[PDB]
């Protein structure tokens, strides 16, 4: 210290030395990039942080943004690993940074945008700890925090009291901060590669798409998510209907549009969270209440329309999915599903499960989903019905938006690289039926298998080391390999790679036939009925 002291455009920062394997790294945690959105500043745009004097304690993570916490199994890591580990508060706008030792000069910078369907998440999660990527890949790992729920996305377009995309603005404000302050940490702002999972990847994609938020980075990684996902965006008319119902549920009396926001700004943060899910219009799964709204400024149209027309940042993209995307979401609503049983659902249950997966669908569209996912030779097989729902939910919400993104991106000669994480853990906490579930590639990307306190196989250490290299090499080169073999993806050649405890193998089609149903035909059907 030495390396534990950093002076930036906004103030001075006190670090922390952290040992990693045979060496160590430096960490700076709880660095604000904005002012606290409290009282009358709640639901507003993020105000940039007022510079401080003198040195700020950046030795501890700060609390996560107020959110709905998953209390389904309080004594289970499978659910608990995703919950806030250092508390919750409205004052939550902080970024965390991991720097190699000795401090580099112009090293690559990876910025993590966490998932949680815009209603949850924390940069402080153990699964997003940057220690291993920083030490093994000699890379700078930054993790930002962004408001979630009504607090981050209460949509009232036009109104300044709730501009609608407040959460993606918080993300933007952090990206703006990284540019103006990462070189004193030993990084290169010319090599800022943004990356995220689920809503995090939707956010990443919403940064490749929006206007004053595409110069803020060089490259992108979208893990198990896309901005054009059905759960990712909302109609300004719906976001308004949602905001008003929140008021009515909380016993508000309002005439004006800003008369609403005033009433909500008074209600306790838990009072609001406890009513947040009652706004959803249908009995559904993978549908989140307060999410990004197409306003007219941040979103000049829909991400679908934007990706189609090409209104975006043309740059290198690494994309991919897990073997079982849907399985996590099934156990949060669908009849007959549990992690505590085989979830051998009846034909009756399968049908109601389809209706909950395509909730905005009319009877003819539901019939189409049932046609593709039914074995017309073996209709009453409870194992096929379970596998079929896991596929509907995975395809509709995750894999198919990703393939449309990947096709629309190569519809510009952009080098797009696609993976499939399909190695299932030797020590996974979920039942066999759930396969390789949503979010379980992250621990491999972040180097967790290298930790001897975590009980992983030496074969799992190898794959983590490899994925860390691929992620780093892409952030460096724009090609996740080194010549002495991972190919590009186009709408024409939809090749992808298998990430597992086996040598990189190549596969030709990343669900092209089925995603043609979801992306080409299913919308067309609704435009005709």
């Amino acid at each position, epitope marked *: 210290a030495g390396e534990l002291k950093v002076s930036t455009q906004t103030g001075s920062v006190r670090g922390l030395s952290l040992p990693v394997l045979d060496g160590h790294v430096s960490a700076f945690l709880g660095i604000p990039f904005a002012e606290p959105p409290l009282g009358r500043m709640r639901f507003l745009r993020p105000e940039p942080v007022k510079p401080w004097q003198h040195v700020l304690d950046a030795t501890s993570y700060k609390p996560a943004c107020y959110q*709905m*916490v998953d*209390t*389904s*199994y*309080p*004594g*289970f*890591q*499978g659910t*608990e690993m995703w*919950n806030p580990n250092r508390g919750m508060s409205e004052d939550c706008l902080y970024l965390n940074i991991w720097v190699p030792s000795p401090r580099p000069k112009d090293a690559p910078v990876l910025v993590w945008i966490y998932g949680g369907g815009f209603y949850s998440g924390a940069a402080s999660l153990d699964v997003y700890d940057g220690r291993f990527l920083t030490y093994t890949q000699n890379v700078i790992l930054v993790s930002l925090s962004y408001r979630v729920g009504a607090f981050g996305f209460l949509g009232l377009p036009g109104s300044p009291e709730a501009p609608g995309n407040m959460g993606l603005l918080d993300q933007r404000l952090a990206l703006q901060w990284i540019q103006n302050n990462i070189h004193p940490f030993g990084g290169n702002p010319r090599a800022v590669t943004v990356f995220g999972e689920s809503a995090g990847a939707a956010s990443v994609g919403m940064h490749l798409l929006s206007t004053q938020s595409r110069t803020l980075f060089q490259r992108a990684i979208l893990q198990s998510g896309g901005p054009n996902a059905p759960w990712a965006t909302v109609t300004p008319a719906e976001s308004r209907g949602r905001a008003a119902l929140l008021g009515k549920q909380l016993g508000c009396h309002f005439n004006n549009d800003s008369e609403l926001v005033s009433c909500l700004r008074s209600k306790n943060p*838990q009072e609001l*969270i*406890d*009513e947040e*899910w009652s706004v959803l219009p249908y009995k559904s799964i993978f549908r989140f209440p307060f999410v990004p709204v197409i306003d007219g400024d941040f979103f000049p149209d829909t991400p679908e329309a934007m990706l189609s027309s090409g209104n975006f940042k043309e740059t290198q993209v690494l994309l991919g999915v897990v073997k079982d995307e849907g399985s996590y979401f099934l156990i949060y609503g669908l009849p007959g599903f*549990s*992690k*505590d049983n085989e979830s051998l659902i009846s034909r009756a249950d399968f049908l109601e499960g389809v209706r909950m997966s395509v909730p905005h669908a009319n009877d003819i569209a539901t019939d189409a989903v049932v046609l593709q996912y039914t074995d017309w030779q073996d209709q009453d097989n409870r194992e096929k019905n379970r596998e079929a729902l896991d596929d509907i939910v995975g395809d509709h919400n995750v894999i198919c938006p990703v393939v449309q993104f990947a096709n629309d991106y190569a519809k510009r000669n952009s080098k797009v690289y696609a993976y499939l994480f399909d190695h299932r853990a030797s020590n996974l*906490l979920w039942p066999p039926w759930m396969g390789v579930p949503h979010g379980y590639e992250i621990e491999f990307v972040f180097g967790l298998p290298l930790n001897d306190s975590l*009980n992983y196989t030496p074969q799992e250490k190898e794959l983590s080391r490899r994925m860390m290299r691929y992620w780093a090499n892409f952030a460096r080169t724009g090609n996740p390999t080194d010549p002495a073999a991972w190919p590009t993806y186009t709408a024409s050649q939809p090749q992808y790679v298998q990430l597992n405890t086996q040598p990189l193998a190549t596969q030709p089609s990343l669900r092209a036939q089925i995603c043609a149903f979801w992306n080409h035909f299913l919308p067309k059907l609704l435009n005709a009925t």
Partner: antibody
Amino acid sequence: EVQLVESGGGLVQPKGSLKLSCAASGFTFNTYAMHWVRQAPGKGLEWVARIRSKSNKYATHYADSVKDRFTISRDDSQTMLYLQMNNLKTEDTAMYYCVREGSYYDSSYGAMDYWGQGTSVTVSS
Amino acid sequence: QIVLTQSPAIMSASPGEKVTMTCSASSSVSYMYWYHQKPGSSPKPWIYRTSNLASGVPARFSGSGSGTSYSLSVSSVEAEDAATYYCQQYNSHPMTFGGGTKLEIKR
């Protein structure tokens, strides 16, 4: 001070019915997950059922030996927990505790941090 | 049905002795919870999430464990510690409890 007061217990003939009540006080009942736990004489503890908050859509989960015979319910306005027990069996003879689970907000997160004194249930002819 | 096996069923220790109770799970669990039970009283929370002592529990008590193997220790046992200690898991449904350990203090 946190208090849990069970009532409704007693002697019921086999195949019979009984409804247990629980008077809760000293905490924001509606924000808590409540449970019913039983203890046969001289034996250990057996979980009966859970009921989550209104936010967690009053989601009920049952012990298999009880699924579809017992029903766990709430009335947050009266701060009351209930256990409707139908088709009672000699095996159900036990002390029934009305228990509170510690919220994310408490140090006791997930634990049965408060148990009532119990209500004795005897299933006999 | 995750089966929790407490051993010994009955434990006897002189005042001031270090004592360790174990809880063995049929399948690996993320955390273990402990409660104590005295005669004519309902159980009381004792340890939260493997190692965090409950409000009012003396410092001489400690918890620990991982995967399938969990334990509760008393550094220096006192007469006050005569009770039955049960372990609980809240990893999978149904939440289950061990058979318990009757801690008896010699005199």
